[PDB]
Amino acid sequence: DIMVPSFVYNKLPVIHFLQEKRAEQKLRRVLDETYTEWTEELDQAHVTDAITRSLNI
């Protein structure tokens, strides 16, 4: 009735703060893993050059 409730009450703030920090850490890790991917595709100039070779020009 008295002791355990008082100690739980004393615990509450630190746990709340630590859990808030943990959530912010999760969000930060989520953000840090985002990178914009740039893909390289075969230049069409080579395709045009090959077309010329097929044209036998």
- Interface contacts to another protein, rule CB under 8 A: 9-10, 12-14, 16-18, 22-23, 25, 27, 30-31, 34, 36-38, 41-42
Cα separation, 14 vs 1, in Å, equals 22
Question: Shortest approach of another protein to residue 27 CB, angstroms?
Answer: 6
Closest to another protein by CB, 12 vs 57, is: 12
Closest to another protein by CB, 1 vs 56, is: 1
